A paper describes a structure:
To gain structural insight into the role of ThsB in the Thoeris defense system, we determined the crystal structure of B. cereus ThsB. Two ThsB molecules were found in the asymmetric unit, and the RMSD value of the Cα atoms was only 0.9 Å, indicating high similarity. ThsB exhibited a four-layered structure in which α-helices and β-sheets were alternately stacked. A five-stranded parallel β-sheet (β2–β1–β3–β4–β10) and five α-helices comprise the Rossmann-like fold, with α1, α2, and α5 on the concave side of the β-sheet and α3 and α4 on the convex side. An additional antiparallel β-sheet (β5–β9) is located adjacent to the α4 helix in an approximately parallel orientation. However, excluding the additional antiparallel β-sheet, the Rossmann-like fold portion of ThsB revealed a structural resemblance to TIR domain proteins such as human sterile alpha and TIR motif containing 1 (SARM1), nucleoside monophosphate hydrolases, and toll-like receptors. Despite the high structural similarity to SARM1, ThsB did not cleave NAD+ in our in vitro assay. By contrast, our SEC-MALS analysis indicated that ThsB exists as a monomer even at high concentrations (~1 mM). When expressing (His)6-maltose binding protein (MBP)-tagged ThsA together with untagged ThsB in E. coli cells, ThsB did not co-purify with ThsA in nickel-affinity chromatography. These observations suggest that ThsB does not form a stable complex with ThsA. On this basis, we tested the hydrolase activity of ThsB in the presence of various ribonucleotides such as AMP, GMP, UMP, and CMP, but no hydrolysis was detected. This raises other possibilities; the enzymatic activity of ThsB may be triggered by an unknown in vivo mechanism, or ThsB may have nonenzymatic function(s) as a toll-like receptor.
The Thoeris system is composed of two genes, thsA and thsB. In the present study, we report structural and functional analyses of the ThsA and ThsB proteins from the B. cereus Thoeris defense system. Crystal structures of ThsA and ThsB were determined to resolutions of 2.5 and 1.8 Å, respectively. Combined with previous findings, these results advance our understanding of the molecular mechanism underlying the Thoeris defense system and suggest that NAD+ degradation is a previously unknown strategy for bacterial antiphage resistance.
Numbering used by the authors: 3 to 38, 52 to 192
Amino acid sequence: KRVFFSFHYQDVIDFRVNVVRNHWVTKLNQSAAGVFIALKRLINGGLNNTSVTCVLIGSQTFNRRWVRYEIMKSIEKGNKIIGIHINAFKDKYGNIKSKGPNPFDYLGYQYSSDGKQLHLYEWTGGKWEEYKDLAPYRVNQIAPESLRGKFYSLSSVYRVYDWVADDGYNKFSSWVN
């Protein structure tokens, strides 16, 4: 499978992102996409010809505008989506850090009462607000009453791993498959 990696730029600079990305692309010789209305177009193109989105979670990832977009756009496109904490191993400065917030806790959705549309929300610091960088969209899929008119945080939907705790060295390819 072709994997879209989503991340804070600072985690690229600190050689945290490359630990996971190099495992997939070099060690396992697979292929990745990633970015480090125009910028959305670029990201959309990156997400095209991928089937899995992998959010690499560092200290500030939860707060990044285009990480949020990459996640929301990934849902609309029907990508598999997972998160992986990347703070538990040493960065290029030789430091280990505590886990950052789960980006999925800061994003959410609600199905419309007729079940035909999906409304999108993000946490803006003191409240939930309608998400502005991606429009609500039509779901062509069945939407049972038990799913309608209820708010869900994305952390109730997508799975999060830790590279060290969950042994990504042995298990990453299973997480995206």
